[PDB]
Ligand binder design. Structure first.
Ligand SMILES: COC(=O)[C@H](CCCCN(O)C(C)=O)NC(=O)[C@@H](CCCCN(O)C(C)=O)NC(=O)c1cccc(O)c1O
Ligand SMILES: COC(=O)[C@H](CCCCN(O)C(C)=O)NC(=O)[C@@H](CCCCN(O)C(C)=O)NC(=O)c1cccc(O)c1O
Ligand SMILES: [Fe+3]
Ligand code: NA
Length: 174
């Protein structure tokens, strides 16, 4: 019913040193997308989408994804609660997602004003899913940065067809 490439040990997912949560606020474009449930589809290629991070009084993030689907904009909202160390988070109100028993976020690297790599891992219906997002402050990033993403995705066991670069669009995400 399902076959998944295993989640890597956390020992080989770096953590961004000295994480500045206020500086990580704002809109990010998903320019690179990889994971064990992520699969390249040339018939119907992945459209680019955007994720907005905004701190609250209590320093949790209100994370809002906006994506273009069925000729409309869909708004996926959830809370990231600070975890064991800075740059590391857990999901708030996990109770509202049936089957979901675990959720981890980890900021691998970022220069705040241009690019970022973030690692996600969830366990749901006892199935362990993980993904890496290549966040871009603009819709385009350099070749260097994208290969860096490609080769990092591979260091966690992902083949080429599990790595995608969503195609830039104008609807919803601007
Ligand atoms: O119901 C389901 O069985 C699972 C529940 C997702 C588990 C939580 N969870 O994954 C998060 C918070 O990230 N629902 C999805 O898989 C759909 C939800 C559409 C309704 N997810 C998304 O639409 C989605 C959009 C942007 C980024 C994401 O990571 C998404 O999962
Ligand atoms: C992550 O971005 C994505 O491309 C889409 C977002 C959906 C947007 C679609 N839509 O609503 C639109 C276009 O309007 N979703 C995933 O690929 C799922 C696959 C696992 C599904 C688990 N599952 O329920 C099954 C049946 O396989 N998610 C993850 O792989 C995943 C892994 C770790 C942490 C997460 O939070 C995840 O979501
Ligand atoms: Fe998700
Ligand atoms: Na270049």
């Amino acid at each position: 019913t399902s076959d998944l490439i295993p989640a890597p040990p956390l020992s080989k997912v770096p953590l961004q040193q000295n994480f500045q949560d206020n500086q990580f606020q704002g809109k990010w474009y998903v320019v690179g997308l990889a994971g064990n449930a992520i699969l390249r589809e040339d018939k119907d290629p992945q459209k680019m989408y955007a994720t907005i991070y905004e701190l609250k009084e209590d320093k949790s993030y209100n994370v809002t994804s906006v994506l273009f689907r069925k000729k409309k904009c869909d708004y996926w909202i959830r809370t990231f609660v600070p975890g064991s160390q800075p740059g590391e988070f857990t999901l708030g109100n996990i109770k509202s997602y049936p089957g979901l028993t675990s959720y981890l976020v980890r900021v691998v690297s970022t220069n705040y004003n241009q690019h970022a790599m973030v690692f996600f891992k969830k366990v749901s219906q006892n199935r362990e899913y993980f993904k890496i997002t290549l966040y871009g402050r603009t819709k385009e990033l350099t070749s260097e940065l994208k290969e860096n993403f490609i080769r990092f995705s591979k260091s966690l066991g992902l083949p080429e067809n599990h790595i995608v670069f969503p195609v830039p669009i104008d609807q919803c995400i601007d």
